[PDB]
Design an enzyme around this catalytic site. Structure first.
Site, PDB file in Angstrom:
ATOM      1  CG  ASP A 267      -0.272   3.027   4.461  1.00 26.34           C
ATOM      2  OD1 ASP A 267       0.176   2.027   3.784  1.00 26.34           O
ATOM      3  OD2 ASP A 267      -1.237   2.960   5.292  1.00 26.34           O
TER       4      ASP A 267
ATOM      5  CG  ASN B   3      -3.119  -2.961   6.011  1.00 27.41           C
ATOM      6  OD1 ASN B   3      -1.971  -2.681   6.043  1.00 27.41           O
ATOM      7  ND2 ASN B   3      -4.010  -1.924   5.459  1.00 27.41           N
TER       8      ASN B   3
ATOM      9  CG  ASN C 179      -1.621  -1.202   1.333  1.00 25.04           C
ATOM     10  OD1 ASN C 179      -2.426  -1.821   0.426  1.00 25.04           O
ATOM     11  ND2 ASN C 179      -1.564  -1.928   2.488  1.00 25.04           N
TER      12      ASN C 179
END
Ligand SMILES: [Br-]
Ligand SMILES: [Br-]
Ligand SMILES: [Br-]
Ligand SMILES: [Br-]
Ligand SMILES: [Br-]
Ligand SMILES: [Br-]
Ligand SMILES: [Br-]
Ligand code: NA
EC number: 3.2.1.17
Length: 129
Positions: A48, A59, A46
């Site tokens: 970030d 995640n 991702n």
């Protein structure tokens, strides 16, 4: 490992996922289809800096430890690599925690966008259960 459709349904049912938190088996299979295409080894980074792991793309920002997400949590208390095994036990137990945190399966954006409100029973149709 790349599961077949009915193979994954039976494995999810054996691990107590069918109707867990009110979500029928077809919802979990659908979400696995569009998160990972049934591949336990799937990973995706991702923006970030966190990474999603496994059959349900869990995640690292919140749920597992991969040693490269500064400031993240490890709420399932598990190495993210454990979510990539051919045995789905670690991914199922963590998903049970994720789906109980208040937002249901809306935690999985592909579920909300591609499964929610559809005929999810089609994903277990014709399977021997
Ligand atoms: Br399929
Ligand atoms: Br970390
Ligand atoms: Br790296
Ligand atoms: Br934590
Ligand atoms: Br399994
Ligand atoms: Br709910
Ligand atoms: Br269903
Ligand atoms: Na983490």
């Amino acid at each position: 490992k790349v599961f077949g459709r009915c193979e994954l349904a039976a494995a999810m049912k054996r691990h107590g996922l069918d109707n867990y938190r009110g979500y029928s088996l077809g919802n979990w299979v659908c979400a696995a289809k569009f998160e990972s295409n049934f591949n336990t080894q799937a990973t995706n980074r991702n923006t970030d800096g966190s990474t999603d792991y496994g059959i349900l793309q869990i995640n690292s920002r919140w749920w597992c430890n991969d040693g490269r997400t500064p400031g993240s949590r490890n709420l399932c208390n598990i190495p993210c690599s454990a979510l990539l095994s051919s045995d789905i036990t670690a991914s199922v137990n963590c998903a049970k925690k994720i789906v109980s945190d208040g937002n249901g399966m809306n935690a999985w954006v592909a579920w909300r966008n591609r499964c929610k409100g559809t005929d999810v029973q089609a994903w277990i149709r014709g399977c021997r259960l």
